[PDB]
């Protein structure tokens, strides 16, 4: 499938030295490439819970397992539309970008400023300050 090919591509973006193995350092550079700022403790955690070998590295299968845990949808039904509706105060299909930013930064598994910024650049296409959350849901589950 195209799936495993994308996994090969990912491993390909990851291996600078091409040793077949991902290090805590490399995890670091990647997480940072996503816009996160993990601690060494957090990385050692991210490894320890997913390491089967405990080789400090991630081979293709372990990469598969981890990406599988991340990609699987748990509370996602595409009726995440409901989740947006929870915050759509007047139900007009639009949420002001400000409110969205506040909510995302102050509630739940809060997003970083980088994450929020990108999310907002993606969600407010016309930059009018109003966000058509349904189109965002379509885009998001493409």
């Amino acid at each position: 499938e195209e799936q495993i090919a994308e996994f090969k591509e990912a491993f390909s973006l990851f291996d600078k030295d091409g040793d077949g193995t991902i290090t805590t350092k490399e995890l670091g550079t990647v997480m940072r490439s996503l816009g996160q700022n993990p601690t060494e403790a957090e990385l050692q955690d991210m490894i320890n819970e997913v390491d089967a070998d405990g080789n400090g590295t991630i081979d293709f299968p372990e990469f598969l397992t981890m990406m599988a845990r991340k990609m699987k949808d748990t509370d996602s039904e595409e009726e995440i539309r409901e989740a947006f509706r929870v915050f759509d105060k007047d139900g007009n299909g639009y949420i002001s970008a400000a409110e969205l930013r506040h909510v995302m930064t102050n509630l739940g598994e809060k997003l970083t400023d980088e994450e929020v910024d990108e999310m907002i650049r993606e969600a407010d296409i016309d930059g009018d300050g109003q966000v058509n959350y349904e189109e965002f849901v379509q885009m998001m589950t493409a």
């Binding site: 990912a10 990406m67 509706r85 929870v86 509630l107």
Partner: protein, 142 residues
């Protein structure tokens, strides 16, 4: 409203509380709110209706019958007036009718916050998945 609606209420309650613990989990509330008969019933999607109702939750995330009843009824009764005095009277009646004392537990948190949190977790999760997807896309070329 009539006595029939209240008897019906206790009837559904015995179904949702087969042990007469005088409490239900919030996750099921929607279902229960949809399970009733008219006019007390709140058909799905009822989530907003449930979120606008003053609905206290004890630990852990459990709600008591008196609050649910009072709210569902008050939605029909509108503001009061005599219906509030009758509300207090019927509340006392329910207290007296209730066996034991252990079911008296103090308020912890409430609805909105729970559903908002779940919503946030959902959106964050999905967003993360799409970040991953985009990164792999960056990998493919080349």
């Amino acid at each position: 409203l009539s006595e029939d609606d209240f008897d019906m209420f206790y009837e559904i309650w015995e179904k949702f509380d087969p042990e007469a613990t005088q409490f239900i989990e919030y996750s099921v509330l929607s279902d229960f709110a949809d399970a009733l008969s008219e006019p007390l019933r709140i058909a799905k999607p009822n989530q907003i209706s449930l979120i606008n109702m003053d609905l206290p939750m004890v630990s852990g995330d459990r709600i008591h019958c008196m609050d649910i009843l009072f709210a569902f009824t008050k939605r029909v009764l509108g503001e009061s007036g005599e219906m509030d005095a009758l509300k207090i009277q019927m509340e006392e009646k329910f207290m007296a009718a209730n066996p034991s004392k252990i079911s008296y537990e103090p308020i912890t948190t409430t609805l909105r916050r729970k559903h908002e949190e779940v919503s946030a977790m959902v959106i964050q999760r999905a967003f993360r998945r799409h970040l991953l997807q985009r990164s792999l896309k960056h990998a493919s070329f080349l």
